[PDB]
Design a protein around this ligand. Structure first.
Ligand SMILES: Nc1ncnc2c1ncn2[C@@H]1O[C@H](COP(=O)(O)OP(=O)(O)OP(=O)(O)O)[C@@H](O)[C@H]1O
Lengths: 224, 86, 86, 52
């Protein structure tokens, strides 16, 4: 007769499992706040805790308590046989989940950069006819370098913002869409452009690397 | 996130995206409330269609605000009702 | 609640003058197993609380944290206008 | 037979293996982004996961 003690130990395990799960979820939420994604191994552990449903056996044991008045006879011993093995079936899983979630050390991983990240989406008027012209070359134009020119304030930059944001709506074969502001100076502030490209290519920023060496590196990186 | 940013006492037009705040749009539920002394600044920050004017206090409420600012003995000189005193 | 068994053991002390009697063996049998039932738990609690190394976690930021709540007069009408837009 | 319990543990192992494989592939993709080549021992491990 071990059920009377094992079920008591299950209650300790259940209340401890809710404490470990609370620590993990709070730890994971601190990772999603940094725009990271919950670690796949933690996500599997969390999904097993959710699916456990320890309240199911609790109700089943609660009915056996009402049958426990004369459970010695074979009429009520039928329920006691299942519970005596069902508690151990959920106790080991609960204890295994205790020592797994208590052993986590990293809870999130930084996702790969998006194909195209959204840019400021202001309300635009009458830009459909020009955006159609720009797409007609980008989809079909023979030359791979496309130039757009116009007087100041006509809408060149806003065209890029609506063009870049439009790419994430359609389907395209391209892998990275980089928006670079060369307007910063006429002196070509090279370091900040390479920062934008490297950050957009999921590359580490080796600060002390010379500009000429990085330029050779980015040519190989962007060529892939 | 569905944020609400209370932007207190803006004195010049500034770009939200350069400070990190995304400008809320119709598609998003987020709001952005900014206060300023100048209607020109609130118009420059694209708040023209939702402008509110902060008017001065009413005649009655301006008095009981003044009453709460006086000391206990001083208030007892101007508190009494029914009778009238200079 | 370790004081519960202490009182239960305390009554057996009064019966301890003739503890070998089969009538008082009913109480002595329970105490001899109830002490072990609470001793292992007490010792397990020792090695658990002696092993903790972190005792608190920083809670997530509140949805809205309170700001200076001064006494305000006649602000209900304007605050109603602000909510009617919000 | 003992099959009823073993197959239940296989489902746990399969869903955990897909999680470990996802972590490795994301870790490897962060290496190919630096123009590195996937480590030969990792490539053997990945190829065994696919063939399973
Ligand atoms: N179709 C449009 N509808 C509404 N506003 C527009 C439209 N096109 C441009 N604008 C406005 O034009 C303003 C001027 O900035 P914009 O990005 O258009 O400049 P630009 O054409 O790149 O010129 P430059 O870089 O030489 O100053 C922006 O604040 C933007 O709101």
């Amino acid at each position: 007769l071990h059920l009377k003690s094992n079920w008591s130990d299950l209650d300790k395990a259940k209340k401890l499992l809710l404490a470990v799960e609370t620590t993990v979820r709070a730890r994971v939420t601190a990772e999603v706040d940094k725009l990271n994604i919950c670690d796949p191994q933690v996500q599997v552990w969390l999904r097993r805790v959710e699916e456990l449903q320890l309240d199911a056996i609790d109700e089943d044991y609660s009915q056996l308590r009402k049958y426990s008045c004369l459970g010695q006879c074979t009429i009520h011993a039928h329920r006691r046989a299942s519970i005596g093995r069902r508690v151990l079936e959920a106790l080991d899983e609960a204890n295994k989940l205790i020592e797994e979630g208590r052993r986590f050390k990293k809870f999130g991983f930084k996702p790969l950069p998006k194909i195209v990240d959204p840019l400021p989406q202001i309300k635009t008027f009458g830009l459909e006819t020009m955006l159609s012209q720009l797409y007609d070359l980008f989809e079909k134009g023979d030359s791979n370098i496309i130039g757009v020119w116009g007087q100041g304030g006509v809408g060149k930059t806003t065209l890029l913002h609506v063009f870049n944001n439009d790419l994430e709506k359609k389907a395209h074969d391209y892998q990275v869409v980089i928006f670079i502001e060369v307007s910063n100076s006429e002196a070509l502030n090279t370091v900040e452009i390479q920062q934008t490209i490297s950050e957009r290519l999921n590359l580490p920023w080796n600060d002390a690397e010379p500009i000429a060496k990085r330029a050779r590196f980015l040519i190989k990186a962007l060529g892939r | 996130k569905r944020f609400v940013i209370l932007l207190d006492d803006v004195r010049k037009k500034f770009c939200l995206e350069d400070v990190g705040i995304p400008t809320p749009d119709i598609n998003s539920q987020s709001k952005l409330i900014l206060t300023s002394r100048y209607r020109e600044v609130c118009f420059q920050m694209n708040a023209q269609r939702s402008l509110i004017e902060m008017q001065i206090l009413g005649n009655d409420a301006s008095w009981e605000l003044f009453l709460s600012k006086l000391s206990t003995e001083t208030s007892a000189a101007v508190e009494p009702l029914g009778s009238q005193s200079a």
